[PDB]
Amino acid sequence: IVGGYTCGANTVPYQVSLNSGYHFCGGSLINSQWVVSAAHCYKSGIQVRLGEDNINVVEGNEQFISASKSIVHPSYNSNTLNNDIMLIKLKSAASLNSRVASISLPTSCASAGTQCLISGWGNTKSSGTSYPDVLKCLKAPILSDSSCKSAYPGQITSNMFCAGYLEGGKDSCQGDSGGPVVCSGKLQGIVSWGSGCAQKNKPGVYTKVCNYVSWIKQTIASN
Ligand SMILES: N=C(N)c1ccc(CNC(=O)[C@@H]2CCCN2C(=O)CNC2CCCC2)cc1
Numbered sequence: 099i100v101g102g103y104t105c106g107a108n109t110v111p112y113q114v115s116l117n118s119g120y121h122f123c124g125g126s127l128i129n130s131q132w133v134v135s136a137a138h139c140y141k142s143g144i145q146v147r148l149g150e151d152n153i154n155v156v157e158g159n160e161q162f163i164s165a166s167k168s169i170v171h172p173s174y175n176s177n178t179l180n181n182d183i184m185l186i187k188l189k190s191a192a193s194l195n196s197r198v199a200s201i202s203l204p205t206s207c208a209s210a211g212t213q214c215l216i217s218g219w220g221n222t223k224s225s226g227t228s229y230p231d232v233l234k235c236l237k238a239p240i241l242s243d244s245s246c247k248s249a250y251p252g253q254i255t256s257n258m259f260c261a262g263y264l265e266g267g268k269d270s271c272q273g274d275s276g277g278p279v280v281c282s283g284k285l286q287g288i289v290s291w292g293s294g295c296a297q298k299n300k301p302g303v304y305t306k307v308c309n310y311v312s313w314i315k316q317t318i319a320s321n
């Protein structure tokens with residue numbers, strides 16, 4: 099997160115860290131046994147880290163649980179990043195508490211101008227690299243369909259939206275991938291892609307979760 103702020107410990111209790119001996123992606127807890135993340139975050143050997151603030155110190159409240167299943171959308175395309183969504187089943191259920199909590203799926207899609215909360219342990223620099231120890235936060239609005247397509251012509255599918263700031267300076271970045279965009283208490287986005295980070299006229303692009311609620315339920319119910 100570039101241009102954001104320190105969230106404060108466990109203020110984003112649905113935020114998880116995907117760990118393979120290092121933080122590599124975020125995700126969102128949607129019930130005691132399932133996480134939503136990005137298909138481009140897929141790999142073998144994922145450990146889901148719940149309850150985290152400082153990812154480099156065991157502070158208390160952490161739950162580390164291996165993934166038992168990682169289910170990438172069968173229509174994911176790694177070139178266009180269409181259908182950039184993955185479900186992870188935990189090997190054991192998480193113990194839910196004030197520090198480890200699920201986030202609701204949407205009942206409907208959000209509209210342009212909706213303010214959302216984006217969070218993660220990704221890069222904090224728009225030029226070069228700096229990676230934080232504690233969780234960072236950014237409030238960002240959803241942009242219009244047309245502004246999104248005018249920024250990234252021929253690259254925005256019906257399964258994507260843009261959010262952020264065209265003037266630059268405030269954005270998600272590498273290492274925030276797979277993490278949440280939460281609007282009015284609902285998970286509406288997944289951190290997916292963009293050109294650079296926090297660059298003028300290049301907002302962030304997010305997977306449109308409302309298009310996947312039925313797929314998520316249907317897939318969890320059969321797994
Ligand atoms: N500016 C952001 N909001 C942002 C940008 C990138 C990420 C992480 N995702 C990525 O790095 C993904 C994975 C595959 C390549 N990719 C892309 O973002 C590549 N950038 C595209 C290429 C042409 C137009 C812009 C996360 C956030």
Ligand SMILES: [Ca+2]
Nearest residue numbers: 152155156157
């Ligand atoms: Ca920790």
